[PDB]
Amino acid sequence: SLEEMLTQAVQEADIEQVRQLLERGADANFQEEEWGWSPLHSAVQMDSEDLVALLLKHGADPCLRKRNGATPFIIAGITGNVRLLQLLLPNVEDVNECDVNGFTAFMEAAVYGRVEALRFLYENGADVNMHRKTKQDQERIRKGGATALMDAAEKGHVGVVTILLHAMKAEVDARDNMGRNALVYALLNPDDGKAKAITRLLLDHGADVNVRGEGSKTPLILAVERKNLDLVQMLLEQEQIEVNDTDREGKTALLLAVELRLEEIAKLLCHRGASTNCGDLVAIARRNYDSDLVKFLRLHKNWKPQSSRWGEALKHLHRIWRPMIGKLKIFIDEEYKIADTAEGGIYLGLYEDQEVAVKRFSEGSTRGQQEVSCLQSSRANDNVVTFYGSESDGSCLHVCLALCEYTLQEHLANHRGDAVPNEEDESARNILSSLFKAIGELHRSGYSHQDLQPQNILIDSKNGTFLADFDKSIKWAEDPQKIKRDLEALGLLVLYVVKKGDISFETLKNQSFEEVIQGSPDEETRDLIHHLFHPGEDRLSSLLAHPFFWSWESRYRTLRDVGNESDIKTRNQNSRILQLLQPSTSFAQWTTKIDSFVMEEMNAYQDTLGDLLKFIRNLGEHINEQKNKKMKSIIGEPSQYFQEKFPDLVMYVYTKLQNTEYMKHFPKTHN
Amino acid sequence: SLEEMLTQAVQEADIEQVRQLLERGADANFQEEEWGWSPLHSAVQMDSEDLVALLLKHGADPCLRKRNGATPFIIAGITGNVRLLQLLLPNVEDVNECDVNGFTAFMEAAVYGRVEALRFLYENGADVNMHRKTKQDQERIRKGGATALMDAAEKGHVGVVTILLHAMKAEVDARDNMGRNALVYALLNPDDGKAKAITRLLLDHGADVNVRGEGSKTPLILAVERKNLDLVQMLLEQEQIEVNDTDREGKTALLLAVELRLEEIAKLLCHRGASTNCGDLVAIARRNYDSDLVKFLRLHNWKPQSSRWGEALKHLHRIWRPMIGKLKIFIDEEYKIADTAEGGIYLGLYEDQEVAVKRFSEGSTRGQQEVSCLQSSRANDNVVTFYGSESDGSCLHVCLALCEYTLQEHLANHRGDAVPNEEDESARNILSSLFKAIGELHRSGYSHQDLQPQNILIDSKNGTFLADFDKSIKWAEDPQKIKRDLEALGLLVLYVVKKGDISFETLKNQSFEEVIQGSPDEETRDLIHHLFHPEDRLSSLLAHPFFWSWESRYRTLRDVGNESDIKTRNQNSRILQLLQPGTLSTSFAQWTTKIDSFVMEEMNAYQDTLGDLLKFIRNLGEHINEQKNKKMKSIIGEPSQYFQEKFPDLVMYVYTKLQNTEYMKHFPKTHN
Ligand SMILES: Nc1ncnc2c1ncn2[C@@H]1O[C@H](COP(=O)(O)OP(=O)(O)NP(=O)(O)O)[C@@H](O)[C@H]1O
Ligand SMILES: Nc1ncnc2c1ncn2[C@@H]1O[C@H](COP(=O)(O)OP(=O)(O)NP(=O)(O)O)[C@@H](O)[C@H]1O
Ligand SMILES: [Mg+2]
Numbered sequence A: 001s002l003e004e005m006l007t008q009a010v011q012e013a014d015i016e017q018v019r020q021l022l023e024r025g026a027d028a029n030f031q032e033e034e035w036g037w038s039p040l041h042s043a044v045q046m047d048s049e050d051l052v053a054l055l056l057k058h059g060a061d062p063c064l065r066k067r068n069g070a071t072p073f074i075i076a077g078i079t080g081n082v083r084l085l086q087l088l089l090p091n092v093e094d095v096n097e098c099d100v101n102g103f104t105a106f107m108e109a110a111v112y113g114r115v116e117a118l119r120f121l122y123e124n125g126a127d128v129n130m131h132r133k134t135k136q137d138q139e140r141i142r143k144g145g146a147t148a149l150m151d152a153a154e155k156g157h158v159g160v161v162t163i164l165l166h167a168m169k170a171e172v173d174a175r176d177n178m179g180r181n182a183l184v185y186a187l188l189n190p191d192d193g194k195a196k197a198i199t200r201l202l203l204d205h206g207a208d209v210n211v212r213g214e215g216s217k218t219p220l221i222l223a224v225e226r227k228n229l230d231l232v233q234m235l236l237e238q239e240q241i242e243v244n245d246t247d248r249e250g251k252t253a254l255l256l257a258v259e260l261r262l263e264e265i266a267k268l269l270c271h272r273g274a275s276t277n278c279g280d281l282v283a284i285a286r287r288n289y290d291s292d293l294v295k296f297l298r299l300h301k302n303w304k305p306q307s308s309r310w311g312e313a314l315k316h317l318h319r320i321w322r323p324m325i326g327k328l329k330i331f332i333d334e335e336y337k338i339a340d341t342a343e344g345g346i347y348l349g350l351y352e353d354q355e356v357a358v359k360r361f362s363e364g365s366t367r368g369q370q371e372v373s374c375l376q377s378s379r380a381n382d383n384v385v386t387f388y389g390s391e392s393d394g395s396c397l398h399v400c401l402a403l404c405e406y407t408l409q410e411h412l413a414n415h416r417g418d419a420v421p422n423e424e425d426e427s428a429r430n431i432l433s434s435l436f437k438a439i440g441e442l443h444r445s446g447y448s449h450q451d452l453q454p455q456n457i458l459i460d461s462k463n464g465t466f467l468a469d470f471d472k473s474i475k476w477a478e479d480p481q482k483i484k485r486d487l488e489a490l491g492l493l494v495l496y497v498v499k500k501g502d503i504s505f506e507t508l509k510n511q512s513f514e515e516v517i518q519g520s521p522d523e524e525t526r527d528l529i530h531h532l533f534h535p536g537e538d539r540l541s542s543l544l545a546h547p548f549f550w551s552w553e554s555r556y557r558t559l560r561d562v563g564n565e566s567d568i569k570t571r572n573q574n575s576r577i578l579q580l581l582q583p584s585t586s587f588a589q590w591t592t593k594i595d596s597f598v599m600e601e602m603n604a605y606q607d608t609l610g611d612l613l614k615f616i617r618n619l620g621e622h623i624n625e626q627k628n629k630k631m632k633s634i635i636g637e638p639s640q641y642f643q644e645k646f647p648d649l650v651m652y653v654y655t656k657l658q659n660t661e662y663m664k665h666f667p668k669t670h671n
Numbered sequence B: 001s002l003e004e005m006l007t008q009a010v011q012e013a014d015i016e017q018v019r020q021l022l023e024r025g026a027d028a029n030f031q032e033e034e035w036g037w038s039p040l041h042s043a044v045q046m047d048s049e050d051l052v053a054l055l056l057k058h059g060a061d062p063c064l065r066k067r068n069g070a071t072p073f074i075i076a077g078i079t080g081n082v083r084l085l086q087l088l089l090p091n092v093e094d095v096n097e098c099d100v101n102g103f104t105a106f107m108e109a110a111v112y113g114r115v116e117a118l119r120f121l122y123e124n125g126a127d128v129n130m131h132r133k134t135k136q137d138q139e140r141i142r143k144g145g146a147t148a149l150m151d152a153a154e155k156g157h158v159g160v161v162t163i164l165l166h167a168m169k170a171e172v173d174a175r176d177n178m179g180r181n182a183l184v185y186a187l188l189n190p191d192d193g194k195a196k197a198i199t200r201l202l203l204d205h206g207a208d209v210n211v212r213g214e215g216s217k218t219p220l221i222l223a224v225e226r227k228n229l230d231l232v233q234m235l236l237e238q239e240q241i242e243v244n245d246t247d248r249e250g251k252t253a254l255l256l257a258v259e260l261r262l263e264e265i266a267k268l269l270c271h272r273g274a275s276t277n278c279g280d281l282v283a284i285a286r287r288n289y290d291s292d293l294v295k296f297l298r299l300h301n302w303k304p305q306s307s308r309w310g311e312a313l314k315h316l317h318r319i320w321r322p323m324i325g326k327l328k329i330f331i332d333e334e335y336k337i338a339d340t341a342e343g344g345i346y347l348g349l350y351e352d353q354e355v356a357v358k359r360f361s362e363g364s365t366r367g368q369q370e371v372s373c374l375q376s377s378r379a380n381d382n383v384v385t386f387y388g389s390e391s392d393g394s395c396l397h398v399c400l401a402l403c404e405y406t407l408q409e410h411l412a413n414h415r416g417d418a419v420p421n422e423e424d425e426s427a428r429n430i431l432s433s434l435f436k437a438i439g440e441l442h443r444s445g446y447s448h449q450d451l452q453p454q455n456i457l458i459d460s461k462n463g464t465f466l467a468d469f470d471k472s473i474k475w476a477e478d479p480q481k482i483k484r485d486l487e488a489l490g491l492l493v494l495y496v497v498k499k500g501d502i503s504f505e506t507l508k509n510q511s512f513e514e515v516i517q518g519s520p521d522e523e524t525r526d527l528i529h530h531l532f533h534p535e536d537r538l539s540s541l542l543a544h545p546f547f548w549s550w551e552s553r554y555r556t557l558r559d560v561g562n563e564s565d566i567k568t569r570n571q572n573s574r575i576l577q578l579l580q581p582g583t584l585s586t587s588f589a590q591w592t593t594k595i596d597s598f599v600m601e602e603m604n605a606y607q608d609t610l611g612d613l614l615k616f617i618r619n620l621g622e623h624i625n626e627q628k629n630k631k632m633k634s635i636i637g638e639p640s641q642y643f644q645e646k647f648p649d650l651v652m653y654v655y656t657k658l659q660n661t662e663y664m665k666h667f668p669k670t671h672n
């Protein structure tokens, strides 16, 4: 708290307290840790000569560099006070000392328009034509290399430019590391008057007119894009200029002029030799309702969409002309409409030339902010609809998403006739495990959905299932109890998908827990829905190991593997395994529910669960043998047989063995 | 080709050919399918009265609407020719007829600055204060509702604005559906002179100064952001103005003024009652090196997800930086992830998400290759997640999901996780992700060209992602280069299986033969073979036994050894014909001698055929854990590992014999 008192004293301009603290023995060369500012740096910055003299008196170091490598002398160029420069100069080894990005005191005087300081630094040996030397990482991307002239041109300091060219012998056509000259920088200055003056000065002294800036634009193109007739005239006076040069996108100055409704600029370019073959200029001028330009122009002369459902319209949208909204191409017409929304709608779009679905909100919409906020945090979530980005025009927030084919509701309806009635539903399993992963990672990211329902779940070309509608999402830290509403709706969605869309979601929403459970067609489904209604943060990832997600072959495999334990086969009643299994079921009296034929042959068995497992293992191993042709024909597919006959068996075994060493008999599962 | 000749004749202004074609019997009401343009619409648009009169003579319909619902009369407002308006008016039912977005002839005359047409339409009953009625989808996002005054203000037509307010009784404070008035529109006009004039006119007639535009900005804030002292003065003259109002981000006009180095504007706001408590204005003015403004002012929880990068990410979140679009970044060694060819990888925050930022020259061909490929790969789950890109004047910043480690670094960090001969599950997962990544990349029309361990990234969750696309190409150009990816993938298979012990450069200097010879097992050899000698080749190979777990391989052998024809040793069965058509240099020739002496005797209470080996594996499998067999169990150890180490070619041999037969059913469930 000695040098910290000094620092605040210098800021507040308290000179006597600075004297006292300096004589009490406080370090004048203290540099604060974050940005390396010293009291001297601060004194020069605040333009206070009394503190500068006082600090130097007590041995402040004028060679001291802050984090960006700037010294107090460099900073003095910024402030532009010649007296501070004079005072510091004797202690300065090199007047052209630079910071880590290449800035000298002279350059800073040019950037900040400090004329007196510029003159003083020139007279004391400043290199007027020094290029900024910078770090290796900057040089390798062609940054750095700018001069004082370029800076002064960019910032619109006409006086400085005049003086640099006339009194200080500045190189008019010097180039930075990207190949730009002062003329390019001059045309980036938004002030029209200063840009016009500086451009004339530069052109008069022989600035090269055929150079390139950003996007490989020429000075002529920059002048057209800025819609300035005078700058265009000025530039077209130079007879060496190349009027038909193209920017990186292949656009010529004429083409841009017609596109931007610049009639006079366009005529002037034609008269100075610009070619009509750069584009369909007539159609463009017509489109703009530039009647006179159309007459003048008349006188003087593969893409494939990925989406099947939306492909035809996507092709048409690619074909037509539209103005861009940042990276988005879109046209509000019924041909390109996907669906209604609360806020006017989902439309097809092209974003960075990728097909997308575009959800449109009012730019002030609270829900649009909820949607975009959640999507911005969910880009790593593979089971969430892929977010491309967003674009505002004046009024509408456009949220661009991966284009999907169908809603889960529509998808289930399209495929409702695929399966033979008691076929195993593999696709239900895949749909739901994606949703578990989606919702699980969404919660991990701190968000809750609030609206999980079949029309917010999207299926893509590859039959991938994605979670989609986040306009009502919330950060759950606010109200943790609302995470349970997601899990409940997920329970409903489990039944919805398992019933193949036959029972509407609204019907399911109007049922009690008990009724939902009673409406389930099997025990795996019942138990799973139970755990979602009574959870009750990796609950969802752990439930992927639940037997609802085990295939029928895997369930049958597990039963057989348990029925092969030596203690089951020897019927050792005091074994750990039979302990576990023997503690109101469909397999009570199981030997009577099996077919009469089958039971007799296998006997060449008691009503215990251990013996049922033993039975399943034995039948499993010997069912396909030639002697057992009749057995095989009666039972049919054995996994389906035992499950239909004993619906609670798989869940019962799972529950008894769940956290024992006999987990090893469960199938390999996701993790 | 009758009405198509007419259309071109009208465009070329060929009046006599139009007469002939009209009398040859061509429909004057033909509307081209795409945009619904008729010859009459086209005639009015090109400002040709002779064609307009001639077309109307032959029964052209002036009520005819094109795709956007505009009639020839509406278009006449755009062109602004009063004579065409006079000519069409008698046939027009309502002078205020509008298109689907609400535009009338009057409004169009205002938008396009057509003064004579504006006057004519006013005198013939135009509703000056009509709000644009538009479609339901537009209204529900609060678009539409603009007036002629707003349009004229927006487009900088001072004459029209003057005339609307003074001669035509325009409502100065009317509002569109978003709640904006003509004053907001006036301040969006980039021409300073016209903006200043129109603003004065509007303010003089009593435009409400406390309104909101985009981002909930006020007219005062718009004036500050546009850096115009005169517009600020003009607005601060109104004594009802609220100087301390905030935009959606909580910024006040003063705060913005200081941030943008607007000394005079800032002083003027302070004098007119703006409060200093809107932010730390002194620190901001200091930061900007606005010394005089500093003197004047003096007188008057976030958590990063990344463990490796978290500390530096916290620091970057804490400091002040200017934004490059959506990207916050600072080029300093503390935030540097790595060197590149061009500019390096630095930590960044993009839409407040932590990212790795790869920097290119804005003109870099490589940078265009990288961004092009990433733009097409957003659906590819096994490619590093692309957030977006941002250019400043010079540098293209490509923003990616921040990963922890390279595959090379990851393998080195975890080299001691596994016991001597443990099954390498993680190698399998790493490689199947890469197969899927590269497979979908090719499907998107792209080739990588540089697949190597330092271009593969592992994230916090141990997910593996493909990453460096500066040398990617569209392969349609040269399809043969797709093979270079598959070759490098073969190298990466060995690299990962050898756990990073053999460097990738070593592997790159070897021939196909040497790579194969350097593999530690038969599954790996066969897989690498199919990658060197190859469209989902790479999705089909996920079914290859390299990706089968040891339990699955053992399960398959047992399941084959349970076939009834194997157990009865029925030599003429289809199954035994597949596995052992008679004369072997396999490792399981004479297999009964290579098994332990003890084990063989007990199971005998067996021939040197493959069928009997399978039979043996099934029997041992079913009875190994029984109490009587305690010694057997202890000698064999884990049986899957036992048979595989004893008979290294057995799994591949069975796979190959049964590959496309009905006995595929014994293979494990696989990805698809
Ligand atoms: N990315 C997409 N790809 C294809 N269809 C989509 C996509 N996003 C949304 N949709 C469809 O458009 C509808 C838009 O609904 P949504 O995004 O849920 O907005 P919402 O305002 O919540 N709609 P509502 O369900 O009517 O309130 C969905 O039901 C889908 O049919
Ligand atoms: N998204 C990322 N997250 C974390 N580290 C990354 C990320 N992207 C790249 N890197 C790291 O930084 C290096 C950048 O290399 P890369 O993106 O391959 O550019 P490059 O020019 O090909 N590099 P070089 O291999 O030097 O040519 C990688 O090897 C990684 O170590
Ligand atoms: Mg919805």
Ligand SMILES: [Mg+2]
Pocket: A451, A469, A470, A471, A472
């Ligand atoms: Mg919704």
Ligand SMILES: [Mg+2]
Pocket: B454, B455, B468
């Ligand atoms: Mg690399």
Ligand SMILES: [Mg+2]
Pocket: B450, B468, B469, B470, B471
């Ligand atoms: Mg590279």
